[PDB]
Amino acid sequence: TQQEKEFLESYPQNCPPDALPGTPGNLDSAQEKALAELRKLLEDAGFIERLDDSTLLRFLRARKFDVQLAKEMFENCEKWRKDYGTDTILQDFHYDEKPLIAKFYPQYYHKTDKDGRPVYFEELGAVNLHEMNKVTSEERMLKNLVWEYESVVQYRLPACSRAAGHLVETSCTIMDLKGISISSAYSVMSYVREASYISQNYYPERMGKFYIINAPFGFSTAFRLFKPFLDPVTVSKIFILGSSYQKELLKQIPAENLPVKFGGKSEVDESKGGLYLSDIGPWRDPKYIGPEGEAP
Numbered sequence: 093t094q095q096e097k098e099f100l101e102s103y104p105q106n107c108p109p110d111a112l113p114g115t116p117g118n119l120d121s122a123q124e125k126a127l128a129e130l131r132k133l134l135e136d137a138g139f140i141e142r143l144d145d146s147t148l149l150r151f152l153r154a155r156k157f158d159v160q161l162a163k164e165m166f167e168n169c170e171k172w173r174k175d176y177g178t179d180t181i182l183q184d185f186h187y188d189e190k191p192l193i194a195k196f197y198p199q200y201y202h203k204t205d206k207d208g209r210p211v212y213f214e215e216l217g218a219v220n221l222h223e224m225n226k227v228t229s230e231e232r233m234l235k236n237l238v239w240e241y242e243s244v245v246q247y248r249l250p251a252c253s254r255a256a257g258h259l260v261e262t263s264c265t266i267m268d269l270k271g272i273s274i275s276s277a278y279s280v281m282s283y284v285r286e287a288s289y290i291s292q293n294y295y296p297e298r299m300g301k302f303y304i305i306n307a308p309f310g311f312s313t314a315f316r317l318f319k320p321f322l323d324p325v326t327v328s329k330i331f332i333l334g335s336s337y338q339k340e341l342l343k344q345i346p347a348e349n350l351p352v353k354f355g356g357k358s359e360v361d362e363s364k365g366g367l368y369l370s371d372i373g374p375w376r377d378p379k380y381i382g383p384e385g386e387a388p
């Protein structure tokens with residue numbers, strides 16, 4: 093439609109030249125041929141939405157540029173979007189529980205990284221599902237996850253792209269394991285498995301950086317010993333850190349963007365919900381909000 097054209101022209105469209113190959117603005121002739129092919133197949137099948145360069149190149153990158161497999165992945169995602177109701181979830185779903193249960197599984201976005209990525213915080217080690225299940229269900233926790241993802245697509249990434257001066261496609265995740273136990277790890281395992289399935293199949297190439305902090309000794313030790321056998325791309329994206337994580341985070345996230353509790357300088361009003369109920373970032377700055385309007 094013409095409104096989506098205005099939306100896609102409302103923010104920078106190119107990744108920086110030193111980003112990964114196959115990203116927007118950094119295609120060779122082979123990759124460019126694959127995008128046009130993939131696009132032709134999907135139009136011929138009757139798809140109209142989500143055929144912009146950024147979306148298609150993400151599915152291509154997830155399947156090593158195999159057009160047929162990327163089309164299959166796109167078709168699986170679109171089927172889920174119809175069954176789950178994802179295209180209207182921002183209107184349909186209302187997580188009014190959140191103020192009651194946020195402290196039992198803290199999840200919040202807060203500002204951006206040095207590359208413009210919105211930073212997502214998950215205090216998994218604090219999880220208390222026994223108390224969380226008094227108020228809400230796992231199905232509603234997953235709806236809230238998809239709601240956030242959709243809010244990242246529609247609102248946070250376009251604002252982050254404008255604030256950074258280049259296309260921003262991905263998040264930066266900080267997962268805090270402080271307080272995790274074997275018991276609580278098993279309790280959250282079903283949720284995490286569902287979340288990962290959704291992320292990997294329906295949001296490919298949206299993970300930019302993933303930091304685990306306060307990892308227990310045995311978990312941390314395994315990654316240290318197997319890091320040499322891991323893809324150097326993987327090693328640049330995924331970090332398993334112990335209790336001295338502050339300096340590593342500050343290399344990735346400006347001090348004024350990183351919350352105090354994690355070694356930064358960024359502060360929020362603890363009397364008005366604190367970080368758990370906050371959603372601070374460029375997507376709340378009118379200078380960086382385009383025709384999509386401001387996020388809910």
Ligand SMILES: COC(=O)[C@@H]1C[C@H]2c3ccc([N+](=O)[O-])c4c3[C@H](C[C@@H]2N(C)C1)CN4C(=O)OCC(Cl)(Cl)Cl
Pocket residue numbers: 212240241242244245263264265287288291292295296297298299302330
């Ligand atoms: C619209 O896009 C968004 O809103 C992003 C998408 C989301 C995401 C996409 C894909 C994967 N993924 O491909 O797997 C993945 C995530 C998780 C974190 C990301 N953001 C917090 C939100 C982490 N994540 C994952 O599963 O974590 C396990 C590993 Cl493999 Cl990193 Cl240890």
